[PDB]
Amino acid sequence: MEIDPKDLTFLKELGTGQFGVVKYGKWRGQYDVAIRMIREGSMSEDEFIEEAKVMMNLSHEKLVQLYGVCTKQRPIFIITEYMANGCLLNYLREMRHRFQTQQLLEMCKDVCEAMEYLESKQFLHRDLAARNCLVNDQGVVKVSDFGMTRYVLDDEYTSSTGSKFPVKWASPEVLMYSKFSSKSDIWAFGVLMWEIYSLGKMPYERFTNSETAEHIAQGLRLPRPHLASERVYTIMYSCWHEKADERPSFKILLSNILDVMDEES
Numbered sequence: 001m002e003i004d005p006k007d008l009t010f011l012k013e014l015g016t017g018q019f020g021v022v023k024y025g026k027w028r029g030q031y032d033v034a035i036r037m038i039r040e041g042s043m044s045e046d047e048f049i050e051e052a053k054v055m056m057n058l059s060h061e062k063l064v065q066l067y068g069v070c071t072k073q074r075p076i077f078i079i080t081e082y083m084a085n086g087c088l089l090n091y092l093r094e095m096r097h098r099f100q101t102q103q104l105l106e107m108c109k110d111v112c113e114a115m116e117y118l119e120s121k122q123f124l125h126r127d128l129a130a131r132n133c134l135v136n137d138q139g140v141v142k143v144s145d146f147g148m149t150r151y152v153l154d155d156e157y158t159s160s161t162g163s164k165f166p167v168k169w170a171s172p173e174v175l176m177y178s179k180f181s182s183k184s185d186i187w188a189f190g191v192l193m194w195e196i197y198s199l200g201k202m203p204y205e206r207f208t209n210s211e212t213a214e215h216i217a218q219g220l221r222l223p224r225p226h227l228a229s230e231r232v233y234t235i236m237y238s239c240w241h242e243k244a245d246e247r248p249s250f251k252i253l254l255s256n257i258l259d260v261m262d263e264e265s
């Protein structure tokens with residue numbers, strides 16, 4: 001879906017991310033959108049444009065919807081669903097004093113549903129983390145930037161030894177061999193659940209990249225958050241099996257989450 005940039009009205013700046021400065025505006029006068037401006041030189045644009053066609057066809061209620069791109073000028077624009085409440089980590093860190101444990105479980109369910117959709121399309125996120133989940137005006141958490149790191153040039157972000165890499169959300173098979181799969185997303189999902197139930201602490205907030213890799217190499221894990229019940233910790237902990245093939249699928253993870261919701265009501 002190519003959008004005509006003459007149909008965009010820019011209203012407010014939402015700040016600047018890694019891929020680009022992003023603004024809030026309206027599309028054809030009526031529809032809320034976010035508009036990302038993609039910095040020249042930051043992404044393999046021709047490869048991204050081919051992949052943008054696939055992301056355009058990803059559609060799930062718990063996935064931030066990509067509405068289209070503007071590619072007949074430079075910089076290219078990404079037009080997406082507007083998420084009034086911003087980053088999940090900021091959201092957790094804003095009203096953490098207000099959340100009920102029932103609310104934290106629903107957020108986990110939101111992300112799991114999005115990932116189950118992605119898993120059903122054999123589409124890897126590649127960088128699942130709270131830093132790319134957003135929250136709408138109804139408090140719904142949505143997954144964002146899915147599959148965006150494959151097109152990033154910067155050498156440190158892509159490299160697994162870079163100072164940009166998400167070591168602390170990376171599974172062993174990624175850190176050792178750059179072996180991405182659904183099971184690497186599962187690992188990250190477990191870490192994300194830790195972030196949600198930890199009200200947005202950085203995992204291993206005191207550790208370097210190297211020390212974290214050594215920790216995971218020794219088979220050690222993040223601890224149970226005080227706010228996490230026994231059952232919920234078991235689900236998230238299951239995502240961190242040393243053997244990728246022993247980790248659950250998002251469908252199985254989801255059913256487990258629904259089972260605890262039925263159990264905790």
Ligand SMILES: */C(C)=C\C(=O)N1CC[C@@H](n2c(=O)n(-c3ccc(Oc4ccccc4)cc3)c3c(N)ncnc32)C1
Binds near residue numbers: 087
């Ligand atoms: C916090 C999780 C991220 C962050 O750095 N923010 C500063 C600006 C603000 N924000 C956005 O960055 N986005 C957003 C993210 C991703 C896209 O493109 C997209 C979505 C899905 C797949 C690929 C690309 C566009 C814009 C915001 C959005 N949509 N709404 C509201 N605030 C956003 C948070």
